Design a protein around this ligand. Structure first.
Ligand SMILES: [K+]
Ligand SMILES: [K+]
Ligand code: NA
Lengths: 128, 131, 133
DNA sequence: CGCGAATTGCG
DNA sequence: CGCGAATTGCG
């Protein structure tokens, strides 16, 4: 049922909003493929969005067709629409997450990609 | 993928909450197969709940294996969960609809059925209609 | 940052959900001021909730403005909310714990109390004094 | 295992 | 309007 030849995105937040970080891993080995240092203020929908697009770029650079597993349906929609819809206030305290979200959107509106973007069935399989 | 040999339920609501009614119709042809008269006050989700269960009862009486189309994904969920989840106040005004819902639930918890409960896809197919 | 003349509660459980108990001790002396016999089936959070409410009634019974320390942020919020937002099924095996909990909410709804309810900071101050073994 | 507070589509 | 669901350290 799980597609093991794939890349999984694992985003954590210390509160929503709160410190947000993420890693992209090989789904089968759990090897860390890329990561993002903690961002002091973010939401988990923003972290998933960024994590997905980071993975899209990682896979594009390496000419991989492996799919991406996310477990935020909202961030998958945001990626598909090439537009994030966060309600998070934008100021100096949130400048970094918003700047990264801007950059991710920009990348999405200037590129094409092959990667399938799948929802992790947390109900059937557990956490990643 | 319309299955024409099926039943479709359609509920009307004079405001929500408000007066609720519903009918069961032949999907292929529009013929009204069963009806419930207006209920003085209920919700749209309670009526879709009752309409599905009513058709379940109707098809079960007739030994039909035909599916039922509903336009309400909430009501489909409720039936499959064998539990409505309305937040309508129980008072004197709402006693009727609430009686009917409890009786729908009780039927669901003491019965099994063959009938596939399918989602009507309005924007793919248009409205549910009775002729 | 530590009110030493205060009361501290904690829960002990074999499993979660499982057997649960609690006690209240004096924060300065570790003197055990009250105890709850092990309850066949509950959750830790239900136990913490009951332990705080027991402590509240204990101090109220004695006209004491000593604070209460718990290290369960959940149970604290539950008490301040006069509502135990537990997810334990209500059945016959869990009837006892649900009845003491329903009654603890009822007690909160119908009384006034002035005890400050404080979070114990385990990361900073070490173990809460009502810690079980 | 249990639990908080906040994020985000019809009919 | 009524109801839609899933996500994210410590005791
Ligand atoms: K594309
Ligand atoms: K609906
Ligand atoms: Na995670």
């Amino acid at each position: 049922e799980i597609i093991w030849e794939s890349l999984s995105v694992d985003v954590g937040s210390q509160g929503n909003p709160g410190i947000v970080e993420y890693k992209g891993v090989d789904t089968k080995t759990g090897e860390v493929l890329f990561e993002r240092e903690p961002i002091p203020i973010g939401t988990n929908n923003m972290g998933e969005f960024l994590a997905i697009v980071h993975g899209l770029r990682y896979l594009k650079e390496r000419n991989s067709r492996k799919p991406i597993y996310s477990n935020s349906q909202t961030a998958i929609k945001w990626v598909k629409d090439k537009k994030a819809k966060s309600t998070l206030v934008r100021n100096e305290e949130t400048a970094l997450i918003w700047k990264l979200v801007d950059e991710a959107e920009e990348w999405l509106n200037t590129h094409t990609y092959e990667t399938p973007i799948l929802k992790w069935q947390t109900d059937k399989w557990g956490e990643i």
